[PDB]
Amino acid sequence: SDTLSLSLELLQQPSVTPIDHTCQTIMADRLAKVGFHIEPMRFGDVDNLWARRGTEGPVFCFAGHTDVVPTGRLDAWNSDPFAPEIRDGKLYGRGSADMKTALAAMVVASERFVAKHPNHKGSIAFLITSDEEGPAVNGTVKVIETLEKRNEKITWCLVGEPSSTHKLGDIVKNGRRGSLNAVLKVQGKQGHVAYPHLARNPIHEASPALAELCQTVWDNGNEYFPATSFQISNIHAGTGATNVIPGALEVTFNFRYSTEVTAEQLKQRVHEILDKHGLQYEIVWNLSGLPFLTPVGELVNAAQTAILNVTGTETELSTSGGTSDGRFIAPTGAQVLELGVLNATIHQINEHVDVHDLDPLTDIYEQILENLLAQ
Amino acid sequence: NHSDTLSLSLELLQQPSVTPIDHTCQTIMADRLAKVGFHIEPMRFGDVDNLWARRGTEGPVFCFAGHTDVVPTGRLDAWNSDPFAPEIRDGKLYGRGSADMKTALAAMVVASERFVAKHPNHKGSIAFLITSDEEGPAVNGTVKVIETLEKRNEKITWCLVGEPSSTHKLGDIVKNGRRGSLNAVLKVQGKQGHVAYPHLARNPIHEASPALAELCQTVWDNGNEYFPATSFQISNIHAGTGATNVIPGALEVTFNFRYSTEVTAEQLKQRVHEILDKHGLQYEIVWNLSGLPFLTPVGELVNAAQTAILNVTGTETELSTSGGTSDGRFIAPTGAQVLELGVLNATIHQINEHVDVHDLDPLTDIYEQILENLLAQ
Ligand SMILES: [Zn+2]
Numbered sequence A: 001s002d003t004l005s006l007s008l009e010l011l012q013q014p015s016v017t018p019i020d021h022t023c024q025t026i027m028a029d030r031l032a033k034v035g036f037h038i039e040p041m042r043f044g045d046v047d048n049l050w051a052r053r054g055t056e057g058p059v060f061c062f063a064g065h066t067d068v069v070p071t072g073r074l075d076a077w078n079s080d081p082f083a084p085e086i087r088d089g090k091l092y093g094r095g096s097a098d099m100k101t102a103l104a105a106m107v108v109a110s111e112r113f114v115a116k117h118p119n120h121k122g123s124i125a126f127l128i129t130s131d132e133e134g135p136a137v138n139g140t141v142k143v144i145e146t147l148e149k150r151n152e153k154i155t156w157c158l159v160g161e162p163s164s165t166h167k168l169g170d171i172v173k174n175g176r177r178g179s180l181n182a183v184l185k186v187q188g189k190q191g192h193v194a195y196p197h198l199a200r201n202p203i204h205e206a207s208p209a210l211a212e213l214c215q216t217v218w219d220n221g222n223e224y225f226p227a228t229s230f231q232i233s234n235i236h237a238g239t240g241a242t243n244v245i246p247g248a249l250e251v252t253f254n255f256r257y258s259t260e261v262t263a264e265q266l267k268q269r270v271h272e273i274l275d276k277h278g279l280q281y282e283i284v285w286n287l288s289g290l291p292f293l294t295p296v297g298e299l300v301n302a303a304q305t306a307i308l309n310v311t312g313t314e315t316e317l318s319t320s321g322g323t324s325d326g327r328f329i330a331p332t333g334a335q336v337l338e339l340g341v342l343n344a345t346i347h348q349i350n351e352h353v354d355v356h357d358l359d360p361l362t363d364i365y366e367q368i369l370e371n372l373l374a375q
Numbered sequence B: 001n002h003s004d005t006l007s008l009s010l011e012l013l014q015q016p017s018v019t020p021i022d023h024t025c026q027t028i029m030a031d032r033l034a035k036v037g038f039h040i041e042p043m044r045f046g047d048v049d050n051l052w053a054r055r056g057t058e059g060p061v062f063c064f065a066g067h068t069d070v071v072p073t074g075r076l077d078a079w080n081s082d083p084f085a086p087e088i089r090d091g092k093l094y095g096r097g098s099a100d101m102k103t104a105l106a107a108m109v110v111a112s113e114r115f116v117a118k119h120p121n122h123k124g125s126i127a128f129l130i131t132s133d134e135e136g137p138a139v140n141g142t143v144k145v146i147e148t149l150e151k152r153n154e155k156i157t158w159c160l161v162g163e164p165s166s167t168h169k170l171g172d173i174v175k176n177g178r179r180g181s182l183n184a185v186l187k188v189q190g191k192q193g194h195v196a197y198p199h200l201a202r203n204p205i206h207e208a209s210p211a212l213a214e215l216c217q218t219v220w221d222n223g224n225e226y227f228p229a230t231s232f233q234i235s236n237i238h239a240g241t242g243a244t245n246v247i248p249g250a251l252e253v254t255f256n257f258r259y260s261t262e263v264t265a266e267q268l269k270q271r272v273h274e275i276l277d278k279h280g281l282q283y284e285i286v287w288n289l290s291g292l293p294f295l296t297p298v299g300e301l302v303n304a305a306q307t308a309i310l311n312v313t314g315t316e317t318e319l320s321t322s323g324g325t326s327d328g329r330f331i332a333p334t335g336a337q338v339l340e341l342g343v344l345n346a347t348i349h350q351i352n353e354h355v356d357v358h359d360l361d362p363l364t365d366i367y368e369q370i371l372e373n374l375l376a377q
């Protein structure tokens, strides 16, 4: 498996956001041999790669990221998350599902396509970033700004995120929910635990509020997007003293929202609920992504047949899960379709992908190139 | 021209003695008590320093108890002046330990020095029981000194703990008892995953929110005519390393109970587990009984404190068991009468901790007169 060998080479590189750690160089050295023009684009602390073969349209673009989320408790892993290995037909490692195995399949699919169809039509491109998991202010969004300023348009963009639920290619995504980040800083007064009346405990004042936020119904979604969901990712207060009341509580939460609401409506109902609990605080809001939905066209049609031909599965469209760099590519007019491995273990400890899906995914990606650029 | 109590207070406050580092504080005290006939017996247990200074070999035995350790500062960006750089602003002495409790240590030493100067033929014995770990776990501090004194039958008649016992004015409150202190480190187990795929994970913050909300507004007891009601407080809460799209695998919640004699530690541990199990939480708790509730009899020590305080400030002191606890919890089981008397407790464990300089000399005079009312007359 050429896909398995390239996957292991990428999975061994600790690439926690926004560190690339040679992943874009490993990919570039491979593409540079099959006629791709390598164009690195570093913005601040983020590395990006724009690789392209051909100068005419239509332009097909494989998109993806080399960064992975933090590993977490290292003693909770059955094997070093950056030491990939196979156990009972399962490749374990951070990035094994999200999404270094797809980066590899996209590269192998491309090499095999250029080999069988060297005089293909249009162009093939690779838009890779080292920050898709974090703030994402210096990743794909800045590469797109560069392409847009020089009138370089993408016709079809397949994002290799793990779109599958139960079996390979059972779900393909042409849109995604918005993402609204927040950092709530509830103010209290540092003092003695046995003299609470002389202090203000922020954990105590905020508990009923965070409890209400967790059970709050935001919207019921619609026929194109699932319902808006609220999730607290981090919460911190105290320095470790058992007899000291902490002076400040920091709560980090996020909203994956449908088109039934706007970032401004969520911001307003949240401040209303916090003020209702009479809290004193500061919030640093951050709109990480807008809800987006690209039209259903030939890319979706090429994927329905490629997926059906390789797995025998009838794919279904959805805007479920998180988001992707497709949110920064969609505004250019490119059709966006996300097709990848199972998302069952993404961001989890002992993240893994079934090895039997690596070759088929590569086959599916190669058939999408044939269905759009061969003829 | 700084008073003797302020002078020694500054010398002790200049020592960054975060638990359990003594940072020479017990040597500063011992070098002075040694000049007025106090035998010096340092007792080091693990990384904790302790001092048993004793003047006299016969009873009754009066003991000054206190600690040289202070709680951590946190960061100098919140402090108007360096917390280990004692300074005076509008008659207020600022610095870590200025109220809890280095100013009382200094007063106790100056009081002892002046008492030995006027009453060299006093009866009984005077002793100091000082530890460098009263603010932390306190497993190698006063509890070990008492273990050592008890095994050799060395009993303390009266013990005055210099903890800041006052509310609005010096000596308005003195304490002969304290509620218990029950610590816990609750670890709610969830399952790390993607925030956008919550059904494939388990958010421990979300599961614990309703449970934590109920504990914060729960009524444990109504206390009694000797102790205030049991209070619950969360000191620390932690989950996540910073990723905004990752559901954390576990939530760590550190909490404490200051409890009255209306409940037992086992009764509190049983209610907490019922409430957590009720919310279907998967977890583990590490309990640590820091101190049992204690109440010592009202005797000569109280009578001597009422007299002294009244004579120095014109204030009729009032008994209480309010606030946190002290090393009196390790001394009370020996049979010694325990009474806590000190400066205002309004700024202890707070940023910009300070003490009114006008209370330093009167406090010294109070301690000196307690020695006179118990070992001279
Ligand atoms: Zn991804």
Ligand SMILES: [Zn+2]
Pocket (backbone or CB within 6 Å): A069, A098, A133, A346, A347
């Ligand atoms: Zn991800």
Ligand SMILES: [Zn+2]
Pocket (backbone or CB within 6 Å): B067, B100, B101, B134, B163, B164
């Ligand atoms: Zn103290």
Ligand SMILES: [Zn+2]
Pocket (backbone or CB within 6 Å): B071, B100, B135, B348, B349
């Ligand atoms: Zn203290």
